[PDB]
Amino acid sequence: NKAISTVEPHYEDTAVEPMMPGSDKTPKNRNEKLTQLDKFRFAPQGESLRTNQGVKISDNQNSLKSGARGSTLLEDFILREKITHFDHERIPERVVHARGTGAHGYFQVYESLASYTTAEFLQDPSVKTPVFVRFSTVQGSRGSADTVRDIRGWATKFYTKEGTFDLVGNNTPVFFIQDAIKFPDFVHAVKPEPHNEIPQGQSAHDTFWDYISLQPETLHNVMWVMSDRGIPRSYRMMEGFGIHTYKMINAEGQCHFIRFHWKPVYGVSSLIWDEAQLLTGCDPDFHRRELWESIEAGDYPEYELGLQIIPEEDEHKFDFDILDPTKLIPESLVPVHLVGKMVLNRNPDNYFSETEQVAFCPGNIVPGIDFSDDPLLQGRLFSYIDTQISRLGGVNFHEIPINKPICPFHNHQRDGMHRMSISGTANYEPNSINNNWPREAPPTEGGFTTYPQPVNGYKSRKRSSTFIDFYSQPRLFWLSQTKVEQNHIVGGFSFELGKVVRPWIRERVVNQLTYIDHQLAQSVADNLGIKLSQEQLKHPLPGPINGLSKDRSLSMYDGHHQILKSRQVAILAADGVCGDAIDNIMKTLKKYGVHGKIFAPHVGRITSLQGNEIEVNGTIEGNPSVMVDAVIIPDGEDSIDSLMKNGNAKHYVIQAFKHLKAIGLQGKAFKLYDALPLPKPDEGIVVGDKAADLAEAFCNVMRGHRIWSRESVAQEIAG
Amino acid sequence: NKAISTVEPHYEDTAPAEKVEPMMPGSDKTPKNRNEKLTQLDKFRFAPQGESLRTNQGVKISDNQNSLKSGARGSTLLEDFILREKITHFDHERIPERVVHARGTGAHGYFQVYESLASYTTAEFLQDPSVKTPVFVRFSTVQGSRGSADTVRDIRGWATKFYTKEGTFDLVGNNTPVFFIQDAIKFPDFVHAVKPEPHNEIPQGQSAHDTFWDYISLQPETLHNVMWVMSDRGIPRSYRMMEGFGIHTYKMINAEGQCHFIRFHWKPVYGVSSLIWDEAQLLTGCDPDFHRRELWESIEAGDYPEYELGLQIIPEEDEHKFDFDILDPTKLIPESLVPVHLVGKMVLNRNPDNYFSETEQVAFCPGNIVPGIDFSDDPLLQGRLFSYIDTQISRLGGVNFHEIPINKPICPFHNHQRDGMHRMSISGTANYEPNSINNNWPREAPPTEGGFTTYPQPVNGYKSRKRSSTFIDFYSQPRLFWLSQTKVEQNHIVGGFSFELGKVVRPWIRERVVNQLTYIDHQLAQSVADNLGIKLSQEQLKHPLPGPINGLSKDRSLSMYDGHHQILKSRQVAILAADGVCGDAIDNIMKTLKKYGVHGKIFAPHVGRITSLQGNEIEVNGTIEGNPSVMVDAVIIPDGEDSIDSLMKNGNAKHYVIQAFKHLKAIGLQGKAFKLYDALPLPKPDEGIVVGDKAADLAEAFCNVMRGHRIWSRESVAQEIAG
């Protein structure tokens, strides 16, 4: 009878916390754009199930048939409307950066930048400019994994009063190529190979390293993506760069050359390769989930907008072209002025309507900002609008709610697929029938104008001679890395080239490396079983850049802060754990803003030896050590005994050790470590009997992020 | 200057001069594997060797390295049509993925019927054993998007396009014999439930989240196919080693107008083998392309996927003789009630040349039948017929997707249809029927000349939306499936439920599923409840269980490892060696493997060549680090003190043994290699550890242990081993 009811219409009620739409979890975090989005929101509470035409549906369980056992009838418009909508849900994925995550927030300028730019959103510190941000990888398709080795895209849409401005950047300060014409060649090389569509989310295949090996301009960004910069811990914990030199124009008409920066408040932190690859296996949504949950936790992403500012007359005073996108501007030469702050504080309600459908383009500038002659950027300007025509179904993608400005947008454009606006005035300028409204705006009233840069030359296809420097900045970046960071670079090249089948591609890439640093090349060559010629070993090395050989800011662990707040600690516990230990650990974790997650052999609640019940965050098996920053094991005779019978929980300790993470062991918990095939405790194995003490010591060890000194012995560990 | 030369036009050779092959397009590696369809596709292929780089309009390009600017350091000019054309095309490369089964792989092949099936159907491709019917097969997962990983826990799709001489026939099936839902109107609800959740689009390629199990707990019809996917059927070893089913009862119509109810089956010649969960999950991390790569390499290796088409045949008069409705797609027809008759053999022997052109753009639909086959009143099947053509209008850019080469039939196809986006064919005759201006050609075909006709099945009822009372049996077949599993398989089913429900945040959803399990089997529920911290009540443990199905309480065919073969040939073995390995041991191992058709892969601490203790060099297949134990069926460690010495200082090499032990795989150690094993935290060598001093002797014992697929007796000890 009740079994029968499940296949009959459902007219009755059917009804620690889960991830929810932003409106449910953070309705108090608001901005002008979110308020505009409210018109498009739906509340089905108390509402009837209906067709798209508003007809109430009586039976959402059955097709209309000729009898209860009959043939389905063509006249069932409810079924056919429902299936038809489902059949056409998918729209094309982005050609690059298909895999991504979005969030709403706001931006505030610290003080007016009127000296350098007229841009409205950089004028008034009391203004909160809404933003939408999409973070992404680059190579993989929509379903690929978050923690791959890749460049990360970083697109910010600023909804200003004078127009929508898009800052479309990456998490490294250079790009792989100099001229936009090479973009389809580069992408095709890195993308899955065209016969078999293998491999997904990896540059570790023949066609990528083939292209690198024939295009030395790529080596600089290659050095960045082979470093640990290629596997960030979190979108909250990486830097951001617009890469291109833009222009800033002030009210006098003065032009400064500009480069954009995002500097994260939560520090710059990365995974290690072994850990990252494991994580694509156990949580392919790790970065998306982490960002969603950090917003729900209150650990809101925060980044400072910075600018490198170069007066126009200084354009030619560097050992590199500032118009060359494979070159960075060292912060030792030109420092980054932090001019504003961006806070991400609201998750979307519907991923598809907002994150999937958002459209960003570098050509979406506003008055006060202008383009430079960087030949990569000039090609990008054409591409973003053109691509949206098929991705979002036509030329009205700006009417999709996430893409609408919050300022007015009157013009004489009309029609196109899915036109929402209804115009009733003259569709041509100049007209007199409507007295020529809307009207052109004079530059002094905010009408956009291009800065009158001089143009002198001949029409030609030619790479500028000032662009032909491929190895100096790669060498500078290499020399600025710490020695652990240098080894991970070597491990990156060696693991990736190890998956290239054609040996001559491997040898050709190593040969390129000999023009950057000889021991870099030697170390990769050794790993690949390649004998370097002596001619190769003495290949000439580039000189210093404006008297510079290292730049501290290019190193993650030596040049940037590591933040304790918002990190995650696994607490391994079973029934019989000491309840007061757990309380003291949690209270300490919280004091520093760290999140303790109780992982146990079963979900639900575990019972402490004191008899109190403790709510579990997930199973050990379901939440491996790669998902947390550190591991702590509280005391309790029955718990420890249960964990020593558990292969996963023992493995949890071995793996966290191999991944250089902090491990805290209370009392009898040390027994567990001692029973394992692990060396004796080091600076990262915190052992204590007092829970509070142990936790404070454990938190201090976490501040260092990883126990780098353990790395040599870690390679001998069977885990 | 060579550096400048890389940013200027490339007018000279780039290939290295003449001083383990890579995967290649099938035309490159297997051009002698041919069929009528590949020959048809040959017209659309292109050889660029010696050809100039050109625009799509045919204009030679002089400088593919630079945009046209005002000076070498100037602004890019709008008049650069070469740039704009190249960027335009790239900007528009992507088309929508399939709304389900977006992650898939395809291969070309051919089908051959064993004996004429004329006594059951007129379908031309089942008439003549002499004919080789070309096929294209696309395997897939279901839930995930295009970039999702191969070895997830999911149902696998299996669609086969038969290019028959009287029409293209699509058999569109899955790797389990039932589906989750009874009526197609539920399909968007079910799919929305299993797909990533709409606020955050989490999770990818997993049913382990709240909305899926929310739906399951409220729709008990889903429980049969959920048992299948929670079992190890949901994580197959290889597309070459799973079964396939059309699921629906179809009809077959002979020349005499007789109708027989049928169910399609695919039986793999390489047997039915599955991964285990911990392995499958590790595999998605270290190779998301595992099945795609495996299939492609199996064809290049000549281990052609081979499958026998099977038919369950039920006479019209027998329709109502079963304790289930044969029109119910949550019901299987037990093979001990109705046997499966093998009637033909399909072999896949050529990989595509271009994945996008062939595999991505292929369109399959269950509405694409041929004369001799008809539909039944299965209400899931009926709804599917509308959906496949409709979806393809937007996915493939319009209603001429049948003109895309991979979709074209190999027979004639004249009709009065015209126009539509990207019309390739040029018509010059009357576009209506009847016409006299071209004498009514093309013309309708009489049924006795092969014109399609629907078999006149009686139709009697009332227009209504109602679930048939004969469909309301949700627990008998899940119980049947459960009781037919061995204890090992039963345990893995419990682990699948427990792992998945462990990731369900809302606890009432976990408890409602466990409650549903008490109506299937009380020990099933209890074990899952224990793993979820759920205390079952006395009333729950005395919930009534259903009775046997036409006298059956167990069916041997429903068990993967008790009712199906394991095949040694095409399996992969890791051979772990470093510098100083006993070269003759590797040689005698390799030849013993080649003897049984097993592939040995030498994995070392570095790619290139290792040198044996004898002094000779051995080309290696890749690094231990880059090729962990989840990627192979078994592991063997040859002798050589220097090689063993190196491996025992290699953390990955030691973990290789530990992991392969925990994943119940066969391990062969020769001479001092056992010293590596003793140093690890592993017990008394069991039946699945082979130890011998002489290499050829050891390999023979090794291969013979490999025949059991996995060492199930080791499962209890394996849980305590440190990962």
Ligand code: HEM
């Ligand atoms: C400095 C170099 C570049 C950077 C930093 C960059 C950055 C990005 C980012 C972050 C996205 C993803 C935006 C999103 O979330 O929706 C993106 C998309 C894209 N970019 Fe680039 N890009 C660069 C160069 C290029 C070039 C040279 C081209 C080709 C001319 C190109 C074409 C595209 C296209 C077509 C998309 C997809 C846009 C869409 O579908 O919405 N970009 N780029």
Ligand code: HEM
């Ligand atoms: C017996 C149950 C079903 C099975 C075995 C099944 C099987 C499949 C398979 C294997 C594919 C992938 C084909 C490919 O490789 O391209 C597929 C795709 C699809 N199925 Fe199903 N399906 C079933 C039920 C349904 C239902 C009930 C619907 C909707 C009413 C549906 C709609 C679709 C759609 C729209 C596609 C995408 C086709 C395309 O994009 O070309 N299926 N099905």
